[PDB]
Curated annotation (Swiss-Prot):
Cofactor note: Binds 2 calcium ions per subunit.
Binding-site list for Ca(2+) 1: 175, 177, 200
Gene name in the database record: PROK
Organism: Parengyodontium album (Tritirachium album)
Top-level EC class: hydrolase
Range within the parent protein: 106 to 384 of 384
UniProt-recorded name of the protein: Proteinase K
Taxon lineage: Eukaryota, Fungi, Dikarya, Ascomycota, Pezizomycotina
Length: 279
């Protein structure tokens, strides 16, 4: 299948070269898999989700996304026009408030919740969790991420937006999950993207068009936008039976475009997510 005039990021992950505008993908499109978006919530009634999104847990007075961040990330995972895996099932978990802030105890609770809740859902092709959040180092936050990964969920987390070594941030610095850096449309490291040996992979993160609250759309930037590209890609490959939850991150690194990024510091991988599609 092919989406012409796609957002540049979707085109980029189905091509060996920058500058293309068509997104090539297999029709199965992540059907049968599930992705938990752990964020500010999801505006499930957005037409772009076609009824495939729902809220399953909130830690505040309401389950509604009063911010937009969560709705944006979810859209990149699996909305019709802006998403990698256009037929996946999306589940929203609201651990961040409408200012985009959250306590680390609440974030940990949300991760433990997904590990248990997945046993109540029908997800024959596998389960992914996408975490576009983070903060200063905490061994408790890392440990919760590692538990979630160990329970059989593919865990993707943002590297962080401090233009620094991601080893001082959590859950970015947990080695057993998949830590995602950001690139721009000219194959440069995004100027804000964290880096370092703990990074596994890069995704499109600068000027990413996606869904927003009020049934709208907007373009924003961050390692937060790169993380769902990778979460979406994992769900897509699991549906195709190419890989499993335990080994999806490594499979994505092995099959990535290599050496094509610029401004990567020594000791940071030069790998860009890539779906290897062939018609
Ligand atoms: Ca890792």
């Amino acid at each position: 299948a092919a989406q012409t005039n796609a957002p540049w990021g979707l085109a980029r992950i189905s091509s060996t070269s920058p500058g293309t505008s068509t997104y090539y993908y297999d029709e199965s499109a992540g059907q049968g898999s599930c992705v938990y978006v752990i964020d500010t919530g999801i505006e499930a009634s957005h037409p772009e989700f076609e009824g495939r999104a729902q809220m399953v847990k909130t830690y505040y007075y309401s389950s509604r996304d009063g911010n937009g961040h969560g709705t944006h990330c979810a859209g990149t995972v699996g909305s019709r026009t802006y998403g990698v895996a256009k037929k996946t099932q999306l589940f929203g978990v609201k651990v961040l408030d409408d200012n985009g802030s959250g306590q680390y105890s609440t974030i940990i609770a949300g991760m433990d919740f997904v590990a248990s809740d997945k046993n109540n859902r029908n997800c024959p092709k596998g389960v992914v969790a996408s975490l576009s959040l983070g903060g200063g180092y905490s061994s408790s936050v890392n440990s919760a991420a590692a538990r979630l990964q160990s329970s059989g969920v593919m865990v993707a987390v943002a590297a962080g937006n401090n233009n620094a070594d991601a080893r001082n941030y959590s859950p970015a610095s947990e080695p057993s999950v998949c830590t995602v850096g950001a690139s721009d449309r000219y194959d440069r490291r995004s100027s804000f993207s964290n880096y370092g040996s703990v990074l596994d992979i890069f995704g499109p993160g600068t000027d990413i068009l996606s869904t927003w609250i009020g049934g709208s759309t907007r373009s924003i930037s961050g390692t937060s936008m790169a993380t769902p590209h990778v979460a979406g890609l994992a769900a897509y490959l699991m549906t195709l039976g190419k890989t499993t939850a335990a080994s999806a991150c490594r499979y994505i690194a092995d099959t990535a475009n290599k050496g094509d990024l610029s401004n990567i510091p020594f000791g940071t991988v030069n790998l860009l997510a890539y779906n290897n599609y062939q018609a």
